[PDB]
Design a binder for this molecule. Structure first.
Ligand code: ATP
Length: 153
């Protein structure tokens, strides 16, 4: 079979819980993270495998509720921000698109999948500390960077 599709299409959701008012005027926003069920036990947001016929954000949305139980209706996908991570995992480059999302519930339900055994809620520093992977450290980095350029929507 003469393959023609280069790399694998993926889509994740960079979730962030926005608190009411600021505390120490430093932090305020958090990020949802899902620890891998094996390997290096790295922490990454709900990423899915978007199909050519499937939508980009949807794959990231479904993956959210699939690997976190939270759907677009339970969060808030911020528009204007879009970045994808390209890298060959086992032996195939996966393109992971990331969208900023804010869960309406602070204690929102967290329904993970087989691909995730645990999750966490941390800011940029921590989300970056766990997501040792530079690519992710950036996704979460730009997230807070962009959101800080908006207002609330
Ligand atoms: N940002 C990244 N850049 C490059 N490689 C990464 C990045 N994040 C994770 N990886 C690695 O890429 C691989 C992705 O795992 P795999 O392709 O097996 O996905 P998966 O099937 O979604 O995961 P799982 O086995 O846990 O179900 C792992 O070895 C992981 O450590």
């Amino acid at each position: 079979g003469p393959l023609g599709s280069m790399a694998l299409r993926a889509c994740g959701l960079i979730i962030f819980r926005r608190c009411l008012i600021p505390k120490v005027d430093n932090n305020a926003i958090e990020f949802l993270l899902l620890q891998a069920s094996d390997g290096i036990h790295h922490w990454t947001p709900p990423k899915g495998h978007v199909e050519p016929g499937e939508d980009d954000l949807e794959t990231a949305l479904r993956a959210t509720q699939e690997e976190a139980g939270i759907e677009a209706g339970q969060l808030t996908i911020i528009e204007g921000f879009k970045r994808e991570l390209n890298y060959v995992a086992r032996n195939k480059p996966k393109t992971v698109i990331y969208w900023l999302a804010e869960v309406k519930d602070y204690d929102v339900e967290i329904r993970l999948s087989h691909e995730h055994q645990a999750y966490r809620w941390l800011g940029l520093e921590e989300a970056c500390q766990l997501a040792q992977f530079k690519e992710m450290k950036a996704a979460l980095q730009e997230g807070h960077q962009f959101l800080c350029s908006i207002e609330a929507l």
